[PDB]
Design a protein around this ligand. Structure first.
Ligand SMILES: COc1ccc(O[C@@H]2O[C@H](CO)[C@H](O[C@H]3O[C@H](CO)[C@H](O)[C@H](O)[C@H]3O)[C@H](O)[C@H]2O)cc1
Length: 198
């Protein structure tokens, strides 16, 4: 029978970005970059063989994901409104969700492969993801009642690659958006700025 194995490899990079001194009318920006590194399985769904031994054909479909919040609360209890400034080539999907942005990039599909590989790594197992993807530039709208002073906002978010292995040519799968937005948010963008007022 036909089989499909899908595994989500989660990246866990911590980065920071300085917005500097801002007046309340500014939309200061921050850049999120994709850093190749070690990723951990945080989700899978498999019904096929556990691994390929280098002698038989299977098919690959890989899709990169970034799931980012639309609103973040400061530690003093105020909302910061996150807006997309420049998403590059990313596919911005499921735009009606009120809480999260979904950025996808399907970069490999229908690729026949033979070589040895674990086709269904379990949660907590790791691999090195060598892929590089485009930056995403966001901008922040501050509420007019934001208290004056220093802000250091930790924005947790999910980024990683969905790897789909199948027994046939033409195989397609996408992790449901509501599962993707409930995946561990292992990346962090620490946005630093100071509210000078208005
Ligand atoms: C053989 O002919 C083909 C015609 C068109 C194709 O489209 C590509 O399909 C890919 C399938 O993995 C991939 O699409 C995925 O990723 C997109 C975002 O980048 C989007 O989320 C799609 O819904 C998703 O399926 C490529 O991006 C498509 O260009 C493939 C073969």
């Amino acid at each position: 029978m036909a089989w499909n194995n899908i595994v989500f490899y989660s990246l866990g990079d911590v980065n920071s970005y300085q917005g500097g001194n801002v007046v309340i009318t500014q939309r200061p920006q921050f850049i999120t970059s994709w850093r190749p590194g070690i990723a951990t399985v945080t989700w899978n769904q498999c019904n096929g063989p556990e691994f390929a031994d280098g002698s038989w054909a299977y098919y690959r479909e890989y899709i990169a994901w970034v799931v980012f919040p639309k609103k973040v609360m400061t530690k003093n209890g105020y909302p910061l409104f996150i807006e997309v400034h420049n998403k590059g080539s990313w596919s911005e999907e499921n735009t009606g969700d009120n809480d999260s942005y979904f950025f996808l990039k399907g970069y490999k599909w229908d690729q026949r492969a033979f070589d040895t590989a674990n086709l269904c790594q379990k949660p907590g197992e790791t691999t090195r993801l060598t892929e590089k993807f485009d930056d995403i530039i966001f901008k922040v709208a501050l509420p007019a009642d934001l208290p004056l002073g220093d802000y250091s906002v930790t924005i947790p978010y999910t980024s990683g690659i969905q790897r789909h292995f199948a027994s046939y040519l033409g195989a397609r799968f996408k992790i449901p958006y509501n599962v993707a937005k409930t995946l561990p948010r292992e990346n962090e963008m620490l946005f630093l700025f100071k509210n000078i007022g208005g």
